Design an enzyme around this catalytic site. Structure first.
Site, PDB file in Angstrom:
ATOM      1  N   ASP A   1      47.541  48.158  14.884  1.00 39.07           N
ATOM      2  CA  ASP A   1      47.824  47.651  13.537  1.00 39.07           C
ATOM      3  C   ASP A   1      46.638  46.958  12.903  1.00 39.07           C
ATOM      4  O   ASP A   1      46.092  46.017  13.467  1.00 39.07           O
ATOM      5  CB  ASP A   1      49.071  46.740  13.599  1.00 39.07           C
ATOM      6  CG  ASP A   1      50.327  47.520  13.951  1.00 39.07           C
ATOM      7  OD1 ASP A   1      50.942  47.279  15.016  1.00 39.07           O
ATOM      8  OD2 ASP A   1      50.689  48.409  13.149  1.00 39.07           O
TER       9      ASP A   1
ATOM     10  N   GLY B   1      50.342  45.117  19.947  1.00 34.90           N
ATOM     11  CA  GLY B   1      51.494  44.231  19.945  1.00 34.90           C
ATOM     12  C   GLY B   1      52.608  44.838  19.101  1.00 34.90           C
ATOM     13  O   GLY B   1      53.659  44.222  18.912  1.00 34.90           O
TER      14      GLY B   1
ATOM     15  N   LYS C   1      46.872  41.553  26.387  1.00 30.34           N
ATOM     16  CA  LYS C   1      45.876  42.585  26.258  1.00 30.34           C
ATOM     17  C   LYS C   1      44.753  42.479  27.269  1.00 30.34           C
ATOM     18  O   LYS C   1      44.223  43.503  27.708  1.00 30.34           O
ATOM     19  CB  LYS C   1      45.321  42.671  24.828  1.00 30.34           C
ATOM     20  CG  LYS C   1      46.415  42.984  23.804  1.00 30.34           C
ATOM     21  CD  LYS C   1      45.801  43.481  22.536  1.00 30.34           C
ATOM     22  CE  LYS C   1      46.907  43.619  21.454  1.00 30.34           C
ATOM     23  NZ  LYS C   1      46.373  44.243  20.184  1.00 30.34           N
TER      24      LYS C   1
ATOM     25  N   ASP D   1      44.206  39.906  19.846  1.00 32.78           N
ATOM     26  CA  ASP D   1      43.090  40.645  20.448  1.00 32.78           C
ATOM     27  C   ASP D   1      42.147  39.688  21.196  1.00 32.78           C
ATOM     28  O   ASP D   1      41.252  40.117  21.923  1.00 32.78           O
ATOM     29  CB  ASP D   1      42.352  41.441  19.350  1.00 32.78           C
ATOM     30  CG  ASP D   1      43.254  42.475  18.707  1.00 32.78           C
ATOM     31  OD1 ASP D   1      43.965  43.111  19.492  1.00 32.78           O
ATOM     32  OD2 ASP D   1      43.277  42.622  17.451  1.00 32.78           O
TER      33      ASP D   1
HETATM   34 MG   LIG Z   1      45.863  44.366  14.713  1.00 34.45          MG
END
Ligand SMILES: [Mg+2]
Length: 210
Positions: free
Chosen positions: A12, A99, A143, A170
């Site tokens: 995203d 996510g 992650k 991230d």
């Molecule tokens: Mg993103």
């Protein structure tokens, strides 16, 4: 010979231009409320899992046909396929870690030709969303845990990994990565990045990776 590298992309706002959750929120009639939570979550002002469960709960009862209408609006970021193909051309391994949701990420994995895909999942009952989400890309260090796991499977040292993302979720990926690229990112991630790209074309990352 020559070593392989592992490149992980967030989905995203990174591989695609949109926020899957915000697109679905429009069909559910809660676009304003969800967009605000998404922005706070990606700027790092909220716990990710808590913010995602709060947003998904607002989607309760939405028919799966409307979720598909929202997904259809998702468009790949400029240069995405060309960038992935060039990385594969070098013999590199490419993954998408999000996510977001499998219903959206599954498609891009096949469309762009990725080697790995990790995302959460929307729970469905009688053709409608129940309002729950489950998965392994929820905790704060999720992650980074996945980056380490994939690198181990591939025999690739962490110094030969690259993480590309835009949001606060991230950060754990950046922590373990050899090269940290913030792509048209939020300030909290830019602060931690090695390279910040502001031109919206994924091919821009190629210059920084041998
Ligand atoms: Mg993103």
């Amino acid at each position: 010979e020559k070593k392989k590298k592992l490149i992980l992309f967030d989905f995203d706002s990174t591989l695609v231009n949109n926020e899957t959750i915000d697109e679905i929120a429009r069909e559910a009639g809660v676009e304003e409320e969800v967009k605000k939570i998404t922005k706070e979550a990606m700027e790092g002002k909220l716990n990710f899992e808590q913010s995602l469960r709060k947003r998904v709960s607002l989607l309760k009862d939405l028919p799966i046909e409307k979720v598909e209408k929202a997904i259809k609006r998702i468009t790949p970021t400029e240069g995405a396929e060309e960038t992935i193909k060039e990385l594969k051309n070098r013999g590199y391994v490419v993954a998408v870690v999000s996510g977001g949701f499998d219903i959206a990420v599954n498609k891009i994995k096949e469309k762009l030709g990725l080697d790995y895909a990790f995302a959460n999942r929307l729970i469905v009952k009688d053709g409608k969303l129940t309002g729950d989400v489950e998965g392994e890309v929820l905790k704060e260090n999720a992650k980074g845990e996945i980056l380490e796991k994939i690198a181990k499977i591939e025999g690739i040292n962490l110094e030969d990994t690259v993480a590309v993302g835009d949001g606060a979720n991230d950060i754990s990926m950046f922590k373990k990565a050899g090269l940290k690229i913030a792509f048209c990112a939020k300030p909290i991630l830019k602060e931690k990045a090695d390279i910040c790209i502001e031109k919206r074309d994924l091919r821009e990352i190629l210059k920084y990776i041998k």
